[PDB]
A paper describes a structure:
The protein SidK, secreted by Legionella pneumophila, interacts with the V-ATPase to inhibit acidification of the phagolysosome in the early stages of infection. V-ATPases pump protons across a phospholipid membrane using energy from the hydrolysis of adenosine triphosphate (ATP) to adenosine diphosphate (ADP) and inorganic phosphate. Successful pathogens can subvert host defenses by secreting effectors that target V-ATPases to inhibit lysosomal acidification or lysosomal fusion with other cell compartments. This study reveals the structure of the V-ATPase:SidK complex, an assembly formed from the interaction of host and pathogen proteins involved in the infection of phagocytic white blood cells by Legionella pneumophila. Removal of the C-terminal residues 415–573 of SidK did not significantly affect V-ATPase inhibition by the SidK mutants, but truncations of the N-terminal region of the protein has been demonstrated to prevent V-ATPase inhibition. These data show that binding of the N-terminal domain of SidK to the V-ATPase is responsible for its partial yet specific inhibition of V-ATPase activity.
In order to understand how SidK interacts with the V-ATPase, purified full length SidK (residues 1 to 573) and detergent solubilized and purified intact V-ATPase from S. cerevisiae were incubated together and the resulting complex analysed by cryo-EM. In the absence of ATP, V-ATPase adopts three distinct conformations that correspond to different rotational positions of its rotor subcomplex relative to the rest of the enzyme. Particle images were subjected to 3-D classification in order to separate these different conformations of the V-ATPase, as well as different occupancies of SidK binding to the V-ATPase. While V-ATPase particles decorated with SidK were found in all three rotational states of the enzyme, the highest-quality cryo-EM map was obtained for V-ATPase in rotational state 1 fully decorated with three copies of SidK and reached a resolution of 6.8 Å. The distribution of particles in the different rotational states differed slightly from the distribution observed in the absence of SidK: 49%, 23%, and 28% for rotational states 1, 2 and 3 with SidK bound versus 47%, 36%, and 17% without SidK bound. The fitting shows that SidK binds the V-ATPase A-subunit primarily via its first α-helical bundle (blue bracket) and the three copies of SidK each interact mostly with the corresponding N-terminal region of one of the three A-subunits. Surprisingly, comparison of the V-ATPase:SidK3 and V-ATPase structures revealed no major conformational rearrangements in the V-ATPase upon SidK binding. In comparison, the C-terminal region of the ‘open’ A-subunit in the V-ATPase:SidK3 cryo-EM map is well defined (yellow densities, and 4B, surface versus mesh), indicating a more rigid structure when SidK is bound.
Numbering used by the authors:
A (entry chain V): 10 to 158
B (entry chain Q): 1 to 345
C (entry chain c): 5 to 61
D (entry chain b): 400 to 423, 427 to 480, 524 to 560, 567 to 658, 710 to 808, 816 to 829
E (entry chain S): 17 to 163
F (entry chain R): 1 to 213
G (entry chain W), H (entry chain X), J (entry chain U), K (entry chain T): 9 to 158
I (entry chain a): 11 to 158
Write the structure that this text describes.
């Protein structure tokens, strides 16, 4: 065994890829929305900062899972961390993938009408429950991996 | 990029497409023939090129306007219908899709001209998949959408004119030839983006994407410049969708299309092409011809690419229009004014 | 042994553009000698015999 | 951009050519080609040859100062270098101490401007001054570690990488053992700089500040690691250019002198001409690729100091 | 018997790269109506230049096949170095032929377009031939340091 | 062993999907099989600590028939685009497009190239032509004929494809038979000599694999 | 023993979070496009985002119950019912979110023009969530047999 | 044995939930467009989503019945018929849902113009449940013989 | 023993290439026959020329099938895969080339009777690749029966 | 001794160099397209290439720090650590470079017509480098325990 | 021992030669002449071929350094530590060669019309050219400790 390091890095890699795709999808709609009028550029920056907050859960989960790692690697310490990191990584990647399209659609629709910032901010801000549930499942899965031989 | 895939039909179709383009006339022959003014010298000078077979098949002691359209119409049937019969697969499907894309607006012009007492024999030469003896007489004479749906469905494969006929059957496009021509041009650009999106990653396409992207903005600027001072409708489909969403917008093309003196958007979009903000249609057509000619000469020398087939298809229509305007200008015993500047691009 | 002794010997026996300067371009001429001397001091070239035995392993 | 005296391009005239000349004796060709365009500037202005050579001919003082300073650091590399992992261990740690003086000089120059009536500069360069000060102090003490209480794994980045991860430890390795409180004082001084940065803004502003202090705190936190992390290009391009020059010179010098007679003159003339021809294009490629210090000094150095005023101010400084 | 796969697969990439480079370079010599002045005047350098990539893999495969024998030291197992030695020259010859084909097609296409940029296609196309020499030099250096 | 039927099933399955790729849409090659094979090989090769490799045993003979089959299959595909160029021209001119059939002789010689080495590479046996690991040792001599015949067959297929690719553009190539077509024929000969050079270098570097006993 | 049964608990929350993210993105795209023309229908069209995002609680509760039912020791045959229930709940939540997004986009686009299809659009989106409840019930029935071994 | 029979239970509800979600999305995509043309056909268009969603109960019933047969102990021959019954019911439910989606969309678009064409679209969706009923009967007959011991 | 698929691979590949060449020759003959009723006899050369390649794979499959089931070992089922792949690749390539060559020869011969001699010459000369592949399969099948 | 952690040090700089090269290409395409219209924003738009290229220094310093901590004995406490620690910084640098490419291309294309979002694009890249720095911190934390294996 | 790790030296110049070939191939493509000539762009466009070929020049030195440290027969410890340096220089050389190819094509097409874009177009490839040396330094650092195996 001794292969739990890729599962530990997959939580920050999936949240970093989902946050990068959400920031790219937010900047893609913000680049087209900024061409119409330079009066709502500060309002469209909320999707990149909201999508970038999902990487802190995978980073703190990767640091907490890395802090409980033992000196001897075996089969009991290289199987639960892969699913625990893959759960928070896939949850942050799905939340970043939905936050990218939600930030792109809200950033594109926010150019013509500035009143959609409440609904786009609420629908875009309502995607953190998947990453929080994935980090909560990764904490419970990481809590049962102690005493590795 | 290119040269990494194996295509059996693409090699014979690219060699047969490059063989007709290599034997065609050049800019030096058009510049030399444009300077001279004589009906007898035009037949002797034009006999050396590839059009000397069709022009030499039927000719008289005087220059006629009917033989000039019959020469390019006879050369277009052997240059376009001959390659589709000997080809098959995705290359013949894309080549038939391009001829169906040009036949979406070319058949729409005959369908709109059918109410004005027009037939198959009263239409000019245009790019199509077949001649006007199999599908053009029944499609041009057929005024109902039910017969045009079965006539377009009889051809293999399915063309994009069925959706335009279904949208035009309910009166969802326009009551004039302007809105039907703009919606047919936008649907033809959407079909060219659909086939160019489908068969895109066979080779590495670089000049075809820039030629289609510049041709979309040149077609939208030409459609907005054509309706300038004509009182066009801003809420009507006259703005063709382009890949640029940060330089050219639909509100700037719709506002520039209306007679309000709003040609500053072409100057803001300028500095990258041959066009510029002005008030002369001849200078805009000459700059649009030189802008459309850019990236077209590179496809005539590169082989093993899918963009060279579309660039040769547009270069055949541009060379047929320039040869028809050059022969029509010297056929009437006059000197070209706008065709002389666009004779070399 | 180190280059801190040579840089301290250069800095000890050198004013380092202190204190006055010329009239025309006194700021660039004043800080230019201290920046070049401080750049040479960090560029003192402290060679081997502290991390010697090269060409390893 | 209408600053006449300060502070737009004051430290860029020394920090620019000194840090730019460290990437490039190979510096003799840049000093000869840079000094050759002095008298021939009027005749070379109407020759019409190239676009980068015209901008290099306009900035004759920048290429003359950086070309003259590049010969000094270039002559030392091409200290000695005879094997791998010997010369790079000192040239790698030399760029940290070389860039730390310009980093502290930019903070002192930024702290000198705006002259409580001062603030927004006391918290900056405190965490990076402690972490980078202990890393530069460990690199300075690492070259004196003889006897056995020493080592070169690497040093520098190895001590800072091992540090900040163990409070109970002292140093790993080659650090000042007096005894363990260096990391505690560094972590306390770096952790104390967090509230003092945003707290010192309203006291220094007087005789919407929250978002500016948070964005300046996160931008200072990212630029503090990015500014120290961007120093590797000088030693990387210097070691790559020195290895690329010494490989061709060591691979052509031995074959040039063999086969004496006419074959040694012809083969040595053709091999020396092709070797010098490739060496001039390699030195021109490194000189063209040495704009990272100008870009990072123009954006990152100009962001914490105060724009394109330092580029014209650096050439206008040597002219007047 | 595992060491013969590298020598047999050594020139297989250089022959496929030189064949596609010669076919891609020869495919662009169709146009455009001038055969006396410029086609071929200086466009024959990519087709003849792309054929030299297979000689490095063929000579390296003949030297690697002649160097190894069944009665020599082959009980290691150390025969995996011949696969990297042949594949190193084969990938460099295939990439050099693939870049030489696109450089010859772009130089032949841009040669007849402008009569002033003819030296740029030759100068830019001349630098592409040095790619395949590194795999042959590394294959000969790896074969010289072995048994 | 298990690799005996897997090698023939994979060899037939690769040519089946490769031949069905250019055909009508009934089947297609699995592109995920390469990433699944690389991930399955690197995953089992990474963990645990053990040497992962294959072992050839006895057969060693598929390169002999695969060399002449690959040379005939590569030579048979070049004549399609070469012969279709003259029919593609048609009535455009009576020029050299009907007299440029010299490339078809080299394309027909490309099928004999490799097949002559496969015919000369066996004698006095059909099961084994050299020392095999079924009744003796020294199976490297019989093992190398598979890779040498596969390399010579792939080189003959590439030269046969390059000959037809040169001839199909080198039919007439300007507009007619007024300009000479020898410029494309020079590149067709330069892409035609790679089969003879690769067959001579592969036959010389391959060694002797006949007269087994 | 392998002790690799956490992939079944992670696959349920991964599939439910992916289906809820795709349904929330597809419903938020048409909700933003229909909300750009008029903001009165935002409160009516806001139900599909919460309905698509509510499917993640089944995979999160199934992963929490599967993680709570793991214990300190595992066997080779322990990671089967969690993988089947996790894959079934993940596929059911992914199909429910995929149908919920397409139903929400057409519901918002059709409801943007005429405000009369909200009864059928709310009934289709409220009726398409039964697959996640059935897969969560099958994941609970499969999870009930995982608290006795080991 | 390994006791890996949960894949046969989850494979039926996965393909059944995917086909039911695809059919509900296909009917909901055309229901919103057909509801704008006629307000009286709004309540009549809801029958295709409920008819397409009825095929999901087969995989849930087969997975719920096969879920109790696992327990804690297993064997080498127990666990093979459940995969064939689950994949057999899942493929018929996914194909019936996929055909029921396009049949419901084409039946709603053709029924939007004239009301007499709704009987053909309802007849095709009513006639498409025979594959799911036969696959559910084969999955029930295969699931009935799987439980013999324990 | 796994050489049973080798005897069927030659007739499978030759039947697939002959089926595709007969389909393209039948489509080209059917499309060219509509323009004139005099080119029907001239257009039938590509289907008859492409359909003759099945006899080599059938005779090679019968000859390879004749040495199976009586004398077989672990080293006697290798030549049948190389001979079947050899005749199958040459038959499949010759059928696909003969289909497009027959369609292009029928399209060029439909205009005037000039390209029919060239298409009949290339179609008559394309059988050397199938005969050379069939001779290698006959020589490989004749040299069998070495290991019991 | 047996070890397989040698590819983990070289795998770290691959994703950051590929994402930095793609971000430099995407930024150079929009900078080259915007430099033709106006030459004033060409010097301002060149900062995103050098700012995007600084992400490879974290993976190079992590690869040098992981290579410096390499011992002489290979075991289960040293192998597989540099692959995940370098793979996390490589994936974070590849995602940050991939977002920096679309952010630089969209910022250059939007700033080409009317430059008003240059500080927003530079703040988007400066806010996008923190995702690579967060992965680099976990890569340094996992890389710090790659020594002392028995 | 196993004798695995000899492919690392030959694998170095593969991705570097493919990236330099893609950069030199993509640099010549594009518009370079419009009517009869360009504004001296032929002498300026020759820099991207050498700039893309510099990583291929360093890859031969890295592959020669790995080939010199390969040896005829070595232990399994030096073989596992020797492999991995080639993929780091190969991936960064391929990504930097692709970014230099796209930046050379866009800088050649945009530099063909206006000659003022060559300063930024040369600085884009000059700033993107360090990816091969950044991976080559890590490959040389890992290859420097692969000698003297025991």
């Amino acid at each position: 065994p001794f292969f739990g390091a890729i599962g530990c890095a997959s939580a920050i890699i999936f949240t970093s890829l989902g946050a990068a795709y959400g920031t790219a999808k937010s900047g893609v709609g913000i680049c087209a929305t900024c061409v119409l009028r330079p009066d709502l550029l500060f309002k469209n920056i909320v999707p990149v900062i909201m999508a970038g907050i999902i990487a802190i859960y995978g980073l703190v989960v990767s640091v907490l899972v890395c802090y409980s790692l033992g000196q001897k690697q075996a089969l009991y310490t290289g199987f639960i961390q892969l699913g625990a990191g893959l759960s928070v990584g896939l949850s942050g990647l799905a939340a970043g993938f939905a936050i990218g399209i939600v930030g792109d659609a809200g950033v594109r629709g926010s150019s013509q009408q500035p009143r959609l910032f409440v609904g786009m901010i609420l629908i875009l801000i309502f995607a953190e429950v998947l990453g929080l549930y994935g980090l909560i499942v990764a904490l419970l899965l990481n809590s049962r991996a102690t005493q590795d031989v | 990029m290119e040269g990494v895939y194996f295509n059996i039909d693409n090699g014979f179709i690219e060699g047969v497409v490059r063989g007709y383009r290599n034997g065609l006339l050049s800019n030096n022959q058009y510049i030399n023939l444009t300077q001279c003014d004589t009906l007898e010298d035009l037949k002797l000078q034009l006999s050396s090129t590839d059009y000397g077979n069709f022009l030499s098949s039927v000719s008289s002691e005087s220059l006629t306007t009917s033989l000039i359209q019959e020469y390019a119409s006879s050369k277009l049937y052997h240059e376009f219908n001959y390659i589709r019969d000997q080809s098959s697969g995705s290359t013949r499907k894309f080549m038939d899709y391009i001829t169906y894309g040009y036949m979406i607006d070319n058949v729409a012009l005959m369908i709109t001209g059918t109410i004005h007492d027009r037939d198959k024999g009263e239409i000019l030469q245009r790019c199509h998949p077949l001649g006007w003896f199999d599908t053009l007489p029944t499609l041009s004479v057929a005024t109902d959408l039910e017969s045009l749906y079965e006539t377009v469905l009889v051809d293999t494969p399915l063309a994009p004119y069925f959706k335009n006929c279904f949208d035009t059957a309910e009166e969802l496009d326009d009551m004039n030839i302007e809105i039907i021509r703009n919606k047919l041009y936008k649907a033809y650009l959407e079909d060219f983006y659909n086939f160019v999106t489908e068969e895109i990653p066979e080779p590495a396409k670089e000049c075809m994407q820039t030629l289609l992207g510049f041709e979309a903005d040149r077609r939208s600027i030409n459609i907005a410049l054509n309706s300038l001072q004509s009182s066009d409708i801003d809420p009507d489909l006259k703005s063709d969708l382009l890949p640029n969403i940060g330089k050219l917008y639909p509100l700037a093309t719709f506002h520039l299309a209306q007679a309000q003196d709003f040609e500053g958007v072409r100057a803001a979009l300028a500095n990258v092409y041959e066009y510029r903000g002005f008030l002369e249609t001849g200078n805009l057509e000459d700059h649009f011809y030189q802008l459309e000619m850019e990236l077209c000469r590179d496809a005539f020398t590169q082989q093993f690419a899918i963009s060279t087939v579309w660039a040769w298809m547009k270069s055949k229509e541009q060379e047929v229009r320039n040869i028809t305007w050059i022969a029509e200008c010297i056929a009437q015993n006059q000197r070209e004014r706008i065709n002389n500047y666009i004779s070399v691009y | 042994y180190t280059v801190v002794g040579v840089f301290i010997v250069v800095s000890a026996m050198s004013v380092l553009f202190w204190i006055m300067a010329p009239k025309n371009n006194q700021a660039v001429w004043r800080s230019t000698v201290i920046l070049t001397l401080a750049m040479m001091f960090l560029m003192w070239a402290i060679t081997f015999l502290c991390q010697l035995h090269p060409l390893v392993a | 951009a209408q600053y006449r005296e300060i502070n737009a391009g004051l430290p860029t005239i020394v920090t620019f050519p000194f840090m730019f000349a460290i990437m490039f004796g190979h510096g003799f060709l840049m000093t000869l080609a840079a000094l050759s365009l002095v008298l021939n500037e009027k005749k070379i202005n109407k020759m019409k040859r190239g676009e980068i050579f015209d901008m290099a001919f306009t900035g004759r003082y920048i290429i003359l100062l950086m070309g003259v300073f590049s010969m000094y650091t270039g002559f030392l590399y091409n200290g000695t270098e005879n094997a791998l992992l010997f010369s790079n261990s000192y040239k790698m740690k030399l760029s940290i101490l070389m860039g730390f003086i310009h980093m502290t000089y930019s903070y002192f120059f930024s702290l000198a401007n705006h002259l409580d009536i001062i603030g927004n500069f006391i918290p900056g360069l405190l965490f990076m001054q402690g972490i980078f000060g202990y890393l530069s102090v460990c690199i300075v003490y690492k070259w004196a570690v003889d006897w056995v209480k020493d080592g070169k794994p690497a040093p520098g980045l190895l001590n800072m990488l091992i540090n900040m991860f163990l409070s109970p430890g002292t140093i790993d390795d080659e650090l000042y053992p007096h005894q363990a409180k260096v990391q505690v004082f560094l972590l306390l001084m770096a952790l104390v700089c967090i509230p003092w940065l945003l707290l010192v803004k309203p006291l220094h502003f007087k005789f919407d500040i929250m978002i500016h202090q948070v964005i300046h705190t996160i931008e200072f936190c990212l630029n503090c690691v990015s500014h120290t992390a961007s120093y590797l290009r000088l030693w990387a391009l210097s070691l790559a250019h020195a290895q690329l020059s010494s490989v061709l010179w060591t691979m052509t010098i031995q074959i040039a002198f063999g086969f004496r007679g006419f074959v040694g003159v012809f083969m040595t003339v053709a091999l020396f001409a092709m070797w010098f021809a490739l060496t001039c294009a390699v030195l021109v490629l490194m000189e063209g690729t040495s704009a990272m210090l100008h870009s990072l000094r123009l954006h990152w150095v100009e962001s914490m100091s105060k724009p394109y005023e330092p580029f014209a101010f650096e050439y206008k400084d040597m002219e007047v | 018997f595992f060491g013969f796969a590298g020598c047999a697969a050594a020139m297989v990439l250089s022959c496929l790269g030189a064949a596609i480079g010669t076919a891609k370079s020869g495919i662009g010599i169709a146009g455009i109506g001038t055969f006396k002045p410029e086609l071929i005047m200086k466009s024959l350098i990519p087709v003849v230049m792309s054929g030299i990539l297979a000689i490095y893999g063929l000579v390296v495969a003949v030297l690697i096949a002649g160097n190894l024998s069944p009665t020599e030291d082959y009980t290691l197992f150390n025969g995996f170095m011949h696969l990297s030695c042949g594949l190193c020259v084969g990938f460099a010859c295939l990439s050099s032929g693939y870049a030489i084909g696109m450089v010859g097609d772009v130089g032949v296409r841009k040669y007849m377009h402008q009569p002033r940029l003819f030296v740029g296609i030759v100068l830019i196309l001349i630098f592409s031939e040095v790619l395949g020499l590194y795999g042959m030099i590394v294959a000969l250096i790896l074969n010289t340091r072995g048994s | 062993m298990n690799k005996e039927s897997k090698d023939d099933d994979m060899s037939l399955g690769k040519f089946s999907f490769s031949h069905f790729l250019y055909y009508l849409v009934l089947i297609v090659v699995i592109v995920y099989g390469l990433y699944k094979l690389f991930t399955g090989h690197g995953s089992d090769i990474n963990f645990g600590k053990f040497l992962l490799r294959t072992s050839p045993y006895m057969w060693a003979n598929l390169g002999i028939a695969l060399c002449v089959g690959l040379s005939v299959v590569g030579a048979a595909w070049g004549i399609f685009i070469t012969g279709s160029s003259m029919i593609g021209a048609g009535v455009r001119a009576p020029r050299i497009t009907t007299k440029n059939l010299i490339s078809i002789i080299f394309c027909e010689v490309v099928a004999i190239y490799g097949l002559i080495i496969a015919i000369v590479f066996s004698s006095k046996l059909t099961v084994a032509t050299a020392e095999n690991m079924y009744s003796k040792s020294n199976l490297y001599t019989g093992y190398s004929l598979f890779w040498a015949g596969i390399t010579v067959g792939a080189s003959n297929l590439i030269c046969g494809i390059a000959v037809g690719i040169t001839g199909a553009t080198a039919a007439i190539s300007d507009a007619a038979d007024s300009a000479l077509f020898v410029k494309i024929l020079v590149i067709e000969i330069f892409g035609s000599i790679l089969g003879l050079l690769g067959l001579i270098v592969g036959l010389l570097m391959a060694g002797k694999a006949s007269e087994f006993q």
